[PDB]
Design a protein around this ligand. Structure first.
Ligand SMILES: Nc1ncnc2c1ncn2[C@@H]1O[C@H](COP(=O)(O)OP(=O)(O)OP(=O)(O)O)[C@@H](O)[C@H]1O
Ligand SMILES: Nc1ncnc2c1ncn2[C@@H]1O[C@H](COP(=O)(O)OP(=O)(O)O)[C@@H](O)[C@H]1O
Ligand SMILES: [Mg+2]
Lengths: 399, 238, 392, 87, 239, 248
């Protein structure tokens, strides 16, 4: 049966034949609706942006004219090798962002002492001479460097990592709390430890707990930050943060997600600067560094060499007692019943990380919300662990 | 790289561990909890049914089976592997009753069953036998000339006298509870109450008639599996 | 911050049966549109020093740059769109409190001193990435997926509407949700339905759209998108086809792969940037969930994972009812033989079956689809297992 | 060729890695050396480090050789398996 | 890895080959068996023969002995082999003990055979699941389900093959004590369970019924239409 | 992957080696058989006759198994010979034990059990051979069964296996009038199928192998169509086709 193309007569008949009497009117009205909407959107338009003009009470217009005429604009550049200035070769390599690199002299305003390698130099636009160093002035409350003084989490909050928390206690407390014992045992206090374990194990939380116990401020540094836009002057970032830590009292330096940094030119500058701030800075200081990443090998081989990071604490997935302790800790902040079998939930989620446990508790809360109940039940936790964990076979051949 | 030592039971790890036997051990954690307690008045066995469907006939699920009138069994692991183990246990008990015309002790029962086990790595399997470790843990209880006796059998073939042992998906928690709730002169009735308490505390579902099979062996009576009404009587107290 | 600029959302006409009531409702909407246009035009018609001097001081033209640092109240570090950045001054009339690293400062063409700030800079890409006309699809147009719709409403709607339960229970609202499943299951349709019913700003993103040729343009585009989402709060960001950039992280060698990794690390960082209590949620869809990075789907980043299984028999018949709800079917069409046939029919496959059946009906010079037309259509649209005989 | 430290080479390594700790003459490096069979170099450094660590663990009890003994026991094998099915 | 080895435990203690063989049943065809007070029924979904296949030799329900029947799902050839072995063992057991084989014994034999076929390399597991039905010589209704793993279980009314989960839920929601009061009620139950998945009715359905020791006759294609007509009559009666 | 020895199971449950044994039959010569009211026939294609084959033979594809049994082969030649020898062995063993010609169902089940045993266990490659058994019995008169490398089988009235078997069986089922075909109509249908399924405008009698089984006067006679007979049949079909096309 060959298909027959719809003839013009068939097209005409099929269009009209059986149709609503109102169909023509409906189609016309709908098209007019679209045209009218387009017309409204055309005739509203031109929304005023109203740029950031302050009230006229603050305009010293003459002064702005004078600063426009006088004050020169300086491009921002990254400095490089000093090329042995020593008043005989006052020249430096400066990389003016994407524009280019140049070799430039100083300005009468600046001095050689405050200009070195690596900081932000404000070069002019004609001769490109460095006219003012601009330290990044980072002190970053707009981003990472947690700078939390006394983290809310405590020794009770961390659960399961008892061996881990004990090893951490030793290393970052026994020198910190009892320096005399290490002094009279004839050994330099532990220079640092690399807290390695599968992600989500809670190593960060355990570190913050000991920080709260030590009453020493906890500094957490991310790596992706200085992999992304804020690259380059990261050496000056760590310089200033270590400096303020020296100004600060007993401290606790903690590098998480440092795998990104360890795994490299400006990055290499960052770790040789921290070499200068760890080996060059006396190992007797109270700015103990707490290294922590899942990768135990991606760290640069020159980092864990003796006279530097000295031991390694191996965090592992929490056990049954650990899992039930984490469950109780996370459920304390939830509206649940008092007879929840948290040992049962810990059993039902073997080889489950702490993050998985908090997600299970969150899903239990959502399940309780689903039935519009103000209190989560054990059935909700069972369904939550059925959903999160496991992302007939185990019921018909095993028994 | 543990994978090269993973494959096969005849391979030694650098740490000397039998990884396939360890996996058979861990395969017990996929079986329903079984609890057995040793008392001077006898031994009680309590298990978790884990009923898949209310339509299923409960009598088919055999967590507790009778090897002999004087001995009881509790199981946790693969149903098939157990079935073979239980058949061998019964056959060996009847072999002892034939040759020596005496009731063979539960220690010798678990010895023979372990003899059938731990035979995965052996050349006597040419006519046909297990080339892999048995993946079922055995809880043997009964009364013999040494009074009541309870023995737990390890999939590797290891057996130990246990005053109170719990096997299954919840061996750790139930064992931890039995660690502090067990007492030497504990009576059989309070022992059964304690066992049901632990099972209720550790069960995923609520305690009823169809979630537990209960067995008991005392020097006077023979092997007794608690019927429905006896289960209701023992479960109303808890 | 200014509230959510949602879509237009013209009122829905309920009958849709080409009857008088549809005419009444459509004519009412047209009437209101006419009285709106009359008012806007007539009010356009009816009724008609320092600012000019400050415009003179600004000069002509004025370049647009992004503020990055502020050293003092009269100096800052702006960056032109090219990529170069300068140590420039801030003139007095520039309202200072609006200056915040990441804004869009207005720079003088010569000596690029800051002469103003632009509240709305949104580049054409992020501007078109914002939904203006809500899609006509609705939850009524979705057959089945009751659990999926329920989860998405719990995730991106319940915190938006009355959220007191979330902090009553003490659990955080689910920051971000990802949809996965075989192609054509309803992942994009369920996002259209969300956009139709939303009360927040909806930002549709292709995923592959974020990648840009010029260096630093990708992360800048992602940053601008999420900055708009936050500034447009509450808002919903729908990054469809996340696997376009969500693939497994691997060490990069070429510059382009480095830029791709930079764009995704920026997206991940900015997903971490806002708090879950914030009213900006992300929605991502993909077919190859297994090929995603096991860090974008971390429980601390995207807790929820809504599965979209191939529709079952009752969902299949629901979808068939939905897509045949506008057909003039006969009384003979059973529609049960088709949902019987154990196949991998999806929502897209069912819709195509309906369209093909309509085309068969047209092929017979009839406008009433019959069972035979559906029968031939199912075979026609189904393309491409176990040999017959092995498995009885 | 770098051979495995034999016995006195083991003693020498132990000695060298222990001169910066206030270790008393009460210790006996030769006994530790004859208890360092199969040990190779850096293992002895780990022995010294762990001996100091438990010397702290005993309560900062400086002047001890029993710490060197326990350190010789643990080293890399400090984790104790507690593995079942082994008689 | 740990999947391509029948006698290798996975790190999580799974014999993945056995589970794959078990899952191979789900690719078969639905077969539901229900036992009643005096009847046991075997409902299977019959594949529609296109134009030439002889339905006489596409046997899905087969009788091991005069007192036992079974329906399989998952692999025709393995099914045929296990059927032949099961009838050989039934005859051998009647030779050894002279009394007819109880359903439990033949089910145990089938399970043990499949088990011994899944305990060594070079022996692929029997990728079928069997629904053993029949009456013991004392006259009791027993139904058994055998798994490719080599285990067996007692079910009052179970379903195997594809869509077996849906039929399982149907039976859970519809198996009542009064639903098996009469043979016709059990037939209605099993037909409804089948139509839950095979909605066409009429054809694509094969039933075998066993009353008390009559040498079961499979419902021939003259009253299956009559029984489905009665089912439809009741279906319009209550609605 | 899971494409190792046949005693393996894919996670989805497929027996990939068995599947490859299935799909391998598509490389074999096309053979078909049709059930008529008062006779059965086997039509097979001689895919390999180059120039210098002796044709010292009774039939290559068709193999007679018993005074009531005949079958056509499609697969590897070695497995073909082994399976045919086993077929003769089991048929004669049944004849010796029971003093009665073996039923088609029983013999087919025996061979299929052997084939399943060759894929059930042992680490042995399954027989990559598909068969088409033709025979008669008092139990069901004339029967046609199509075997399978997996060890399955089915009772058919019209079936084609080999290359282009799908199209051949599709058109055959489109053009089969069950219960109303004699031997002549079945022969014409088989010739038309071989014409439409083989890669020749005018197929020759040499490339065609036809054997007919017919029960008459108490005994069943299995005869292969002689060269003159098959030539007459194909010429009758080509003049029928010429009449059909000139009428159109
Ligand atoms: N549950 C459903 N009910 C009704 N229609 C549906 C359903 N699921 C899918 N469809 C139909 O399928 C069409 C395509 O679906 P959609 O765009 O949501 O696919 P998708 O899963 O996002 O696919 P992809 O990931 O391959 O791009 C929709 O236009 C809709 O008509
Ligand atoms: N031992 C523990 N006790 C309590 N909470 C834990 C523990 N381990 C992990 N968590 C939970 O994990 C979450 C954060 O994990 P995090 O410390 O970032 O993992 P990582 O080990 O990668 O640093 C917190 O919400 C915390 O409550
Ligand atoms: Mg899509």
């Amino acid at each position: 049966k060959p298909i027959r193309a719809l003839d013009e007569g068939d097209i005409a008949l099929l269009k009209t034949y059986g149709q609503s009497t109102y169909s023509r009117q409906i189609k016309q009205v709908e098209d007019d609706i679209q045209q009218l909407l387009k017309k409204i959107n055309e005739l509203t338009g031109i929304k005023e942006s109203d740029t950031g003009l302050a009230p006229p009470a603050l305009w010293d217009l003459a002064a702005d004219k004078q600063t426009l005429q006088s004050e020169q604009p300086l491009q921002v550049a990254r400095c490089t090798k000093i090329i042995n200035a020593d008043s005989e070769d006052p020249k430096y390599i400066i990389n003016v962002k994407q524009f280019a690199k140049f070799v430039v002299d100083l300005s009468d305003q600046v001095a050689p002492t405050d200009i070195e390698e690596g900081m932000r130099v404000g070069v002019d636009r004609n001769k490109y001479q460095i006219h003012i160093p601009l330290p990044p002035k980072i002190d970053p409350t707009v981003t990472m460097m947690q700078v939390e003084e006394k983290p809310d989490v405590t020794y009770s909050d961390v659960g399961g990592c008892k061996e881990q928390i004990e090893k951490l206690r030793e290393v970052v407390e026994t020198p910190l709390l009892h320096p005399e014992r290490f002094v009279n045992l004839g050994i330099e206090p532990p220079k640092g430890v690399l807290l390695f374990g599968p992600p989500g194990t809670g190593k960060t939380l355990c570190a913050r707990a000991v920080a709260n116990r030590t009453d020493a401020c906890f500094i957490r540094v991310i790596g992706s930050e200085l992999v992304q836009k804020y690259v380059g002057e990261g050496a000056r970032m760590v310089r200033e943060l270590f400096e303020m830590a020296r100004t600060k009292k007993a401290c606790l330096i903690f590098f998480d997600e440092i795998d990104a940094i360890g795994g490299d030119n400006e990055v290499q500058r960052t770790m040789l600067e921290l070499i200068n701030q760890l080996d060059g800075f006396d190992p007797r200081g109270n700015i103990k560094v707490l290294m922590a990443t899942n990768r135990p090998d991606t760290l640069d081989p020159a980092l864990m060499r003796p006279g530097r990071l000295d031991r390694k604490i191996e965090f592992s997935l929490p056990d049954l007692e650990g899992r039930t302790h984490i469950f109780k800790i996370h459920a304390r902040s939830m509206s649940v019943e008092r007879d929840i079998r948290f040992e049962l939930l810990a059993r039902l989620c073997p080889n489950s990380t702490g993050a998985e446990i908090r997600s299970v508790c969150t899903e239990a809360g959502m399940f309780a919300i689903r039935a519009r109940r103000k209190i989560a039940t054990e059935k909700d936790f069972l369904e939550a662990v059925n959903k999160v964990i496991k992302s007939t076979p185990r019921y018909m051949t095993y028994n | 790289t543990r994978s090269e030592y993973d494959r096969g039971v005849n391979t030694f790890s650098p740490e000397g561990r039998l990884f396939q036997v360890e996996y058979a051990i861990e395969a017990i954690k996929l079986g329903s909890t079984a609890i057995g307690i040793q008392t001077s008045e006898g031994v009680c066995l309590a298990v978790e049914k884990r009923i898949t469907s209310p339509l299923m006939e409960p009598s088919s699920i055999e967590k507790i089976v009778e090897i002999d009138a004087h001995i009881g069994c509790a199981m946790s692991g693969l149903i098939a592997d157990a079935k073979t183990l239980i058949d061998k246990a019964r056959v060996e008990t009847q072999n002892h009753w034939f040759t020596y015309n005496e009731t063979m002790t539960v220690e010798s029962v678990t010895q023979a069953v372990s003899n059938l086990a731990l035979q995965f790595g052996e050349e006597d399997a040419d006519p046909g036998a297990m080339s892999r470790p048995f993946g079922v843990a055995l809880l043997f209880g009964g009364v013999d000339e040494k009074g009541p006796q309870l023995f737990h059998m390890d999939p590797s073939g290891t057996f130990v006298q246990c005053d109170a042992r719990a096997i299954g998906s919840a061996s750790e928690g139930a064992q931890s509870s039995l660690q502090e709730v067990y007492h030497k002169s504990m009576t059989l009735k309070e022992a059964i109450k304690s066992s049901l308490i632990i099972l209720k505390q550790v069960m995923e579902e609520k305690l009823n008639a169809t979630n537990i099979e209960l067995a008991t062996v005392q020097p006077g009576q023979n092997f007794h599996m608690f019927t429905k009404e006896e289960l209701e009587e023992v479960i109303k107290d808890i | 911050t200014k509230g959510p600029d949602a879509a237009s959302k013209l009122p829905l006409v309920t009958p849709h049966t080409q009857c008088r009531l549809k005419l009444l409702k459509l004519e009412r909407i047209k009437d209101y549109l006419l009285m709106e246009e009359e008012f806007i035009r007539n009010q356009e018609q009816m009724k008609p020093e320092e600012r000019s001097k400050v415009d003179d001081l600004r000069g002509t033209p004025m370049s647009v740059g992004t503020l990055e640092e502020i050293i003092d109240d009269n100096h800052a570090i702006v960056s032109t769109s090219v990529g170069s950045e300068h140590y420039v001054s801030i003139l007095s009339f520039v309202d200072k409190d609006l200056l915040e690293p990441g804004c869009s400062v207005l720079l003088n063409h010569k000596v690029h001193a800051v002469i103003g700030v632009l509240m709305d800079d949104t580049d054409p890409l992020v501007t078109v990435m914002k939904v203006e006309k809500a899609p006509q699809e609705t939850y009524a147009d979705i057959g089945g997926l009751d659990n999926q719709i329920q989860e998405i409403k719990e995730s991106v709607e319940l915190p938006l509407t009355h959220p007191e339960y979330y902090e009553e229970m003490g659990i955080k609202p689910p920051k971000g949700v990802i949809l996965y499943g075989p192609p054509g299951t309803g992942k994009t349709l369920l996002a259209k339905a969300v956009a139709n019913q939303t009360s927040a700003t909806f930002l549709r993103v292709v995923g592959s759209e974020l990648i840009q040729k010029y260096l630093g343009d990708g992360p800048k585009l992602v940053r601008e998108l999420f900055r708009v989402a936050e500034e447009h709060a509450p808002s919903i960001v729908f990054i469809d086809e996340i696997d376009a950039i969500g693939t497994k992280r691997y060490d990069s060698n070429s510059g382009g792969e480095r830029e791709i990794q930079r764009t995704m690390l920026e997206l991940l960082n900015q997903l971490d940037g806002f708090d879950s209590r914030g009213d900006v949620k992300v929605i991502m869809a993909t077919n190859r969930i297994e090929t995603l990075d096991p860090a974008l789907i971390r429980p601390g980043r995207i807790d929820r994972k809504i599965e979209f299984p191939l529709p079952d028999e009752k969902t299949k018949k629901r979808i068939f009812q939905i897509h045949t709800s506008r057909m003039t079917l006969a009384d003979d069409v059973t529609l049960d033989d088709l949902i019987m046939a154990k196949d991998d029919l999806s929502g897209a496959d069912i819709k195509a079956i309906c369209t093909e059946a309509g085309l068969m009906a047209l092929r017979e010079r009839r406008m009433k689809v019959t069972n035979e037309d559906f029968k031939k259509s199912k075979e026609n649209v189904l393309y491409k297992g176990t040999p017959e005989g092995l498995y009885l | 060729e770098f051979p495995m430290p034999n016995e006195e080479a083991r003693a020498r390594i132990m000695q060298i890695h222990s001169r910066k700790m206030n270790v008393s003459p009460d210790v006996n490096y030769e006994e530790l050396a004859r208890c360092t069979d199969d040990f190779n170099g850096a293992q002895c450094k780990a022995v010294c480090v762990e001996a100091g660590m438990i010397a702290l663990r005993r309560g900062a009890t400086e002047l001890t050789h029993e710490d060197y003994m326990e350190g010789i026991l643990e080293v890399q094998a400090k984790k104790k398996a507690n593995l079942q099915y082994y008689a | 890895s740990y999947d391509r080895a029948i006698t290798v435990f996975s790190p999580d203690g799974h014999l993945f080959q056995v589970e794959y063989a078990q899952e191979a049943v789900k690719k078969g065809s639905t077969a539901v068996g229900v036992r009643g007070r005096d009847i046991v029924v075997l409902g299977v979904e019959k594949k529609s023969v296109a134009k030439l296949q002889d339905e006489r030799t596409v046997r899905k329900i087969c009788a091991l002995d005069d007192n036992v029947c079974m329906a399989f799902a998952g692999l025709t050839a393995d099914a045929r082999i296990v059927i032949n072995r099961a009838r050989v063992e039934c005859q051998s057991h009647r030779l050894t003990v002279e009394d007819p084989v109880t359903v439990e014994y033949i089910t145990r034999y089938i399970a043990s055979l499949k088990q011994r076929y899944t305990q060594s390399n070079g022996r692929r597991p029997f990728g079928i699941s069997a629904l053993i039905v029949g009456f013991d010589f004392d006259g009791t209704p027993r139904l058994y389900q055998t798994d490719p793993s080599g285990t067996y279980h007692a079910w009052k009314a179970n379903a195997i093959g594809r869509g077996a989960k849906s039929v399982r839920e149907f039976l859970e929601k519809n198996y009542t004590d009064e639903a098996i009061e009469t043979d016709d009620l059990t037939i209605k139950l099993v037909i409804k369970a089948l139509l839950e998945v095979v909605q066409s009715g009429g054809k694509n359905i094969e039933l075998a019924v066993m009353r008390r020791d009559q040498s079961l006759k499979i419902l021939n294609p003259e009253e299956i239409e009559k029984y489905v007509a009665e089912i439809e009559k009741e279906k319009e009666e209550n609605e | 992957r899971y494409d190792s020895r046949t005693t393996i199971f894919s996670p989805e449950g497929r027996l990939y080696q068995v599947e490859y044994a299935m799909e391998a039959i598509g490389h074999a010569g096309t053979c078909l058989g049709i059930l008529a009211n008062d006779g059965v026939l086997l039509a097979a294609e001689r895919r390999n006759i180059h120039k210098l084959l002796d044709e010292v033979f009774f039939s290559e594809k068709i193999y007679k198994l018993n005074e009531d049994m005949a079958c056509s082969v499609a697969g590897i030649t070695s497995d073909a010979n082994v399976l045919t020898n086993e077929l003769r062995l089991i048929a004669q063993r049944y004849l010796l034990q029971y003093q009665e010609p073996i039923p088609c169902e029983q013999l087919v089940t025996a061979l299929c059990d052997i084939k399943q045993a060759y894929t059930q266990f042992g680490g042995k490659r399954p027989f990559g051979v598909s068969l088409l058994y033709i025979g008669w019995d008092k139990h069901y008169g004339f029967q046609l069964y199509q075997s399978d490398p997996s060890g399955n089988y089915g009772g058919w009235k019209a079936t084609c296996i080999g290359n282009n078997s799908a199209a051949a069986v599709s058109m055959l089922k489109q053009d089969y009038k069950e219960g109303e075909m004699t031997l002549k109509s079945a022969l014409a249908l088989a010739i038309k199928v071989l014409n439409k399924t083989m890669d020749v405008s005018k197929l020759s009698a040499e490339k065609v192998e036809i054997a007919t089984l017919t029960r008459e006067n108490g005994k069943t006679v299995i005869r292969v169509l002689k060269q003159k007979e098959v030539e007459q049949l194909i010429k009758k079909h080509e003049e029928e086709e010429a009449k059909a096309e000139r009428e159109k």
